[PDB]
Amino acid sequence: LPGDFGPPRGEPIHAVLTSPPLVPPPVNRTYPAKVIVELEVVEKEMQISEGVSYTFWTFGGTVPGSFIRVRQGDTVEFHLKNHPSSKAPHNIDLHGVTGPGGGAASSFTAPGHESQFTFKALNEGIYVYHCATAPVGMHIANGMYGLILVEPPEGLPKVDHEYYVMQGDFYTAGKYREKGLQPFDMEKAIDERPSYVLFNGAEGALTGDKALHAKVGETVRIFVGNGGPNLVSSFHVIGAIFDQVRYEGGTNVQKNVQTTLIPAGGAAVVKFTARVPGSYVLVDHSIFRAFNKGAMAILKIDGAENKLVYSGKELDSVYLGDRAAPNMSAVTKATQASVSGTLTVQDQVQAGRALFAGTCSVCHQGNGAGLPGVFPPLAKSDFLAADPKRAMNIVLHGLNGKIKVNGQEYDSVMPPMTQLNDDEVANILTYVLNSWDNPGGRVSAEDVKKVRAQP
Amino acid sequence: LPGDFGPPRGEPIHAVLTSPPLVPPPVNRTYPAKVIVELEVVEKEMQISEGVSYTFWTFGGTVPGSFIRVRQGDTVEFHLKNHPSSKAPHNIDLHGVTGPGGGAASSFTAPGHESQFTFKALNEGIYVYHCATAPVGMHIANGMYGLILVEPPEGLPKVDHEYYVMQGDFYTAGKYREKGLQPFDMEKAIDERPSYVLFNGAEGALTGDKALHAKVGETVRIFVGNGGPNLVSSFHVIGAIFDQVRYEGGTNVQKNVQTTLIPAGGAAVVKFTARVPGSYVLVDHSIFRAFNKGAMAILKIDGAENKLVYSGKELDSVYLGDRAAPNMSAVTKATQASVSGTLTVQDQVQAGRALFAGTCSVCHQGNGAGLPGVFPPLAKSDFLAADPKRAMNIVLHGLNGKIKVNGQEYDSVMPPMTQLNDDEVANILTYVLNSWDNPGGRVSAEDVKKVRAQP
Amino acid sequence: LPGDFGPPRGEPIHAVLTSPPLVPPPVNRTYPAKVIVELEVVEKEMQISEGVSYTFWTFGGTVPGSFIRVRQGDTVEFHLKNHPSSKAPHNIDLHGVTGPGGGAASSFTAPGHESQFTFKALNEGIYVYHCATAPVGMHIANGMYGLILVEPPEGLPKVDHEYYVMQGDFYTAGKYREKGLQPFDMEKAIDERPSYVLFNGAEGALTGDKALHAKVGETVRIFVGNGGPNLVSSFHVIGAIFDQVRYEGGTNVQKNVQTTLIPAGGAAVVKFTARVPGSYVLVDHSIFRAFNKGAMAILKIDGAENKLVYSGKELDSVYLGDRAAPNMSAVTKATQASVSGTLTVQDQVQAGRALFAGTCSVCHQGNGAGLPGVFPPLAKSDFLAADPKRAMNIVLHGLNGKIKVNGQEYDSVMPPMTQLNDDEVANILTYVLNSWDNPGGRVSAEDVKKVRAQP
Ligand code: HEC
Ligand code: HEC
Ligand code: HEC
Ligand SMILES: [Cu+2]
Ligand SMILES: [Cu+2]
Ligand SMILES: [Cu+2]
Ligand SMILES: [Cu+2]
Ligand SMILES: [Cu+2]
Ligand SMILES: [Cu+2]
């Protein structure tokens, strides 16, 4: 067989697993070992987006699950524990395992129980692992996937940084960014119509202050998984190129590409060399996923500009939208204040401030000034002040035709933004009303609900 | 040109075609020949799933159609007959043919007619063929696709087994597993929302007693097609790796991968070496296809276990669900008994028995015992017996909160299983009621229809 | 860095850009230059299909946008102008650019404004460029994408012809071929449910009299892009093979394949050698895209037939449907006559004539004769003449069972053709009624609207 390096030698190794986006250190070993892997399934509520909760099912408390790193030819003793708070039984199928179900039948584990099985890691490569319990798609859709790396015997080449990024598609009963605890939606899942498509389990998991980091001149290796359950990722780095892309344990290595297709259940190792400073965006280039469903992550590169290579400015909210900022924590706070019944005007203002970026500022500008004759001002806008309800209708339903704002005629078109949720429109408009010498007051989500029900 | 080996020599060969999942023998020939291929289109009703009929349109009576095997440089005289019972005209486009439409204009054949055309097989490779008659998508969706292999002049390397597997997506008016003769649904097809995604034309075509077979140490070559019409397959083998994957006649060969993307209309040759015994599952790893729409096939490997490579057990119904068993023939029989108006309790029981596997047994166990305090028993369940209608509501709509069953408190969550059809819920519950010292009686599909209409 | 060929030398070059499907000449240069690229965004209404208008947003007045061709190591000074008639601001992200956003932040351009930025072309390859303005998906869905080629320093190998083809998916409020100015539909876009999937911006952009051309024995290179926004293309040439397929600037080159997956936002260079005459169809082999949504383009090859390679006939309306003809201009004219209120019978007849090809002629024949006993005649049909309204119901809702037509019994099935729009059914039936000694008269779209509302 392949990976024929003999029986385990040395002492048993207890594998140290890491949480995304980090990776365990290189195994740095020239002999096969017995490696004991202990992974615990935990079901728990986490934020899939700001103010939006979801009951995740996780390997090790995170989505994706703990990263496992071993060497080709190791004997792996795999222990799966199912936390007693779990409602469902769980198990594991590891790609790269030689044997039926990738471990599935022997790792079946009821809540409060533990299972174990052993396998030899014959196949070098990066591999998805995932739950394999009926109904399988639900378990995977709830977050039960991660990566296992089986290193070549000599190790991978040294790089400056290694990161762990995994795409998944998620199916909520509610629409994108609709607040509250969102149940899983089987109808959307069967139809392959996800409400969110995400890197590492949440909107903004890898953006803003949670971005990945490197410096100019450094090499970055990223272990990229696609947990699915359903989507194939047109995986792409904005403004950069991959030096190498290698799928699973494949002999083929592609070089110098920017866009690469990762199958559902697939994994790849990609290598990047940072050449100029700024934010490089990892996306699924099925564009509505990246820009309307959350499928964007950032590798932020620090260092000296090189104007001979690129003269332009850093990425901003025109492209990245409301994820250009460090975080959108004001939205979480406003949502929690609504639930508690303590929503203040300032809670709404700060939430709207976060949501205004990109969404409105692309045309109206970050300072509300617009562009005279082309985009009308929201700053000190007589048209806004004159009719707040008309403003709600404008956001939801658009506006066109000749209007007069602060003494100037506009004759253009603002598209409808009907996908904004009632709280989002309310908070945005409350921000605008309380900025730029506008009259203050507030708009409530209930106000917006009524305007949505009858244009 | 390529395949420039001269005019046909020897005698004309009448091609012997094979039905899936078998393949004709290697051509074992060192000279170009004239090869006469005769293929007949037949439209006919077959079972797409147990108790579910569909009007297939087929090349040679099967889906996929008869496998055609020739040598690069052969001159192929292709005869297409359209059976007189056909309602539609038909034709053929063979990928790998050099010429407009891949044969489409010259192979147009009305019902009861025959056509013929000739082409030189210049391009070595594995290729999809399919109908090319307006409306093309309908013809393909109804099953009109297969594979043609054009061998390299020296032949392919010898292997122990060769098999023929083709994915297709199907569009029925009714939902998945809704019984009866199901018409084609154009609205679902245009939207690329299939009701079934299948290997070789039917649910379970390649599972259970219809599994593919090999022995430990043997090599298996599988000719894999994706007839579409629409889907791209994240093609994957559970618990194994492909030694090689080669697309069509491509010069590139990938090695040591487990997951590979096959385009709509694409074909690949994959090679597997059996290392340990058990069931290896071929899936489309867009998981809801494999586990909710039928996209799973089995290669069952016989031989001695190797505990140093894999210590675990064979695949079971936890992962494979109700396809772990040899067949689900009881469902076909119960469905036919309903149509005839002769449905007995025992017909329902045996049908429910088949459907209970995986679907319910993952939590409640194959013996109905559950797990005390975690999953409540269905065996001798006082809670079940106390209210049969409540049991129908539980399957359809779920259950949560504190309950008492056989003197023990449970405080967990059973998800809804709303996608089960009325007959499936009726048969499952009838099985349960007539097992494990439960009180007997029956539930009817009409009972379930009423509970579905008002929770 | 890569592309380290020194500072620009010689004189500044003003790039000459080309409109699809043409490509600028090879740069034919052995030194790095400064290349000044000037591109103007124009928003405008164009025909997405005959009688169907759409407001496209374009780079340079076309979809896809102007082709840009430079050499690896060039310094590119990129000027983006936004025409003053524009309603939206725009910018550009060029794949292959080294730097954040691929130019996005520095190329933000309000209506009536100009922006510029500079970059060094370090990466050789074919690359998509596209708008990068919030909401990004809308901008791209409206047509804002094209290709930039960065040649290797020695140039690409000489070929006889070079062409430029780009797929995109489009989202209209109305259904496929529903006439009028069609707004963009955000709901369909987010769900990845396009109404049209097109090469180069329109149905028939590259079919009939707008086909690409070459001669037997010549080599054709095609720069193929997938602008998306959302779909992955199972890109395929009917009846031919690609000698080479190279993605972006990748080191891997695949050879001798017919079907290849192009990611959303991906681009490839493919090479074809014409071997026999006829029409070769480029499609997205997700078949319902190619045959029901418009994703088909033609490379028409002139030259001597070779019966030893292919004995069959040229592609016709059986496969290609109504795109077999030179154009469908009669449909545009009938649609415009309806809007103006001047629709004549002959306008309808000529429009129906175009629409009858494939759609009806596959069974009923181009001369309406049918096939006695199998497909009934529309020529001098007593059954048609006897009840025009029944004919509308037949097209919309199908027909089966025993009928008598011109003294002969038929007992077959004509499927419903419910996806035909009211004007299409009206025009088809008006064509039939005014042909083949049928009684004349006309059917109106309003007639058909009433039959659709109640079968
Ligand atoms: C460009 C693509 C825009 C985006 C994004 C948003 N708005 Fe807009 N807005 C835009 C135009 C071209 C116009 C004038 C339309 C016309 O008929 O000429 C408007 C108008 C408004 C108004 C009314 C006018 C004013 O007071 O200046 C309001 C209150 C407004 N827009 C608000 C608004 C908000 C809150 C947005 C984000 C949610 C937003 N707009 C986005 C162009 C564009
Ligand atoms: C785990 C994922 C389950 C699957 C699959 C099925 N059931 Fe279940 N069931 C489950 C739990 C955790 C509970 C208790 C819920 C609570 O509120 O604590 C139940 C309960 C039932 C009952 C009622 C209790 C009893 O009699 O034991 C019935 C009748 C029942 N379940 C039936 C049932 C059937 C027929 C299933 C397959 C279709 C099935 N369940 C699946 C957990 C799970
Ligand atoms: C084959 C796939 C067909 C296509 C495409 C179209 N028609 Fe058809 N038609 C077909 C059959 C097999 C039948 C007879 C059905 C039966 O019950 O046996 C018909 C019938 C008609 C009729 C009525 C009979 C007649 O006058 O000949 C009409 C008026 C008719 N069909 C029209 C029609 C048109 C306009 C079509 C294109 C839009 C068309 N048919 C497509 C088979 C097929
Ligand atoms: Cu699980
Ligand atoms: Cu898997
Ligand atoms: Cu056919
Ligand atoms: Cu094809
Ligand atoms: Cu734009
Ligand atoms: Cu891009």
Coordinates of C-alpha atoms and ligand atoms in Angstrom, one line a residue, chain A residues 57 89-91 131-133 139 144, ligand 4:
Chain A
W57 CA -23.9 21.8 15.4
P89 CA -26.5 11.6 17.7
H90 CA -23.4 12.3 15.6
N91 CA -20.6 10.6 13.9
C131 CA -20.9 14.4 10.1
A132 CA -22.4 11.3 8.5
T133 CA -25.6 10.9 10.5
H139 CA -26.1 17.8 10.1
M144 CA -20.6 19.8 11.0
Ligands
CU4 CU -24.1 15.2 13.3

